[PDB]
Amino acid sequence: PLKSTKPIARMTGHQKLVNHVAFSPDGRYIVSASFDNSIKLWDGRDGKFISTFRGHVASVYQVAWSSDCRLLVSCSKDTTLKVWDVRTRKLSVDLPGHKDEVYTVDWSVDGKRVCSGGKDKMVRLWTH
RNA sequence: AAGCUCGUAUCAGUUUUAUGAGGUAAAGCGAAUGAUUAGAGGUUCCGGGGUCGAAAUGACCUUGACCUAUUCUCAAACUUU
Numbered sequence: 601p602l603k604s605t606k607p608i609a610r611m612t613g614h615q616k617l618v619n620h621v622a623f624s625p626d627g628r629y630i631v632s633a634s635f636d637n638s639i640k641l642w643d644g645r646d647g648k649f650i651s652t653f654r655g656h657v658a659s660v661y662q663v664a665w666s667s668d669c670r671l672l673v674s675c676s677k678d679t680t681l682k683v684w685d686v687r688t689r690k691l692s693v694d695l696p697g698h699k700d701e702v703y704t705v706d707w708s709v710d711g712k713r714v715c716s717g718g719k720d721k722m723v724r725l726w727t728h
Numbered sequence: 729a730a731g732c733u734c735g736u737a738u739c740a741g742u743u744u745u746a747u748g749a750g751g752u753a754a755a756g757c758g759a760a761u762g763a764u765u766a767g768a769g770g771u772u773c774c775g776g777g778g779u780c781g782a783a784a785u786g787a788c789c790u791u792g793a794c795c796u797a798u799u800c801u802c803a804a805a806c807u808u809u
Contacts (some may be wrong), residue, residue: 613768615799637798649768654797 609647613640620662624669624686631672631686633660641675642691653684655691661703667711675702675716681726683714697724 616635623630623644630642631653639660641650658677666671671692673683679701685692700719707714714726 615767635799652768675802 603678605703608645611642611647611649613649614638616659619660621708622663622665622672624672625667626669628669629686631665631684632666633663633674633676635659639663639684640670641686651689653691655682655694656721661701662705664705664707666707667709670708672713673707673714675705675718677701678717679720681705681714688695695726698722 614634614636618634621632633639637722638650638652640653646684659678660674663672663674671683671685675681679698681695683693688723698720700714702718704717717723
């Protein structure tokens with residue numbers, strides 16, 4: 601917006617709705633959570649399509665990036681949280697535990713913990 | 729309208745006894761019908777067509793069907809039961 605009204609690019613490719621989009625803290629890359637059972641990676645500057653993170657069986661509600669800017673955590677309908685190493689684009693860790701859907705995810709400023717909450721109503725905090 | 733043959737002689741707009749018959753409710757498309765959905769990324773002697781080497785399995789694209797990786801799981805009135 602500062603540079604211009606024209607959009608840099610339009611990013612198409614998702615099968616279903618984009619519920620949430622997030623730039624990394626450095627702003628280099630974007631991971632976006634989509635309903636299509638994938639969270640998609642895009643180059644933040646140009647808007648080009650890097651790849652799909654398949655692994656989710658169901659809609660992905662939100663994404664939140666780590667303070668360290670290496671990873672993104674998502675919470676999905678499939679009732680798991682997935683931390684993905686974005687750089688490698690490989691699934692770093694799958695963290696099951698919720699009985700029901702996980703609506704919200706957040707990654708702490710210090711980087712130490714990830715918090716989650718959702719349909720199950722219980723908070724689960726995850727640590728290194 | 730016009731006849732024949734008989735007698736304790738034909739039953740019931742109201743009440744109890746639930747044995748048969750049926751194709752309206754449910755389900756499926758994994759051998760029957762339909763609105764069996766919507767995309768991207770590859771591989772080319774020789775699946776089928778051009779340009780450029782007199783040539784030799786010298787090399788490089790585009791335009792249609794697949795595979796791998798996803799989504800929906802097909803309206804109650806099509807049929808049978």
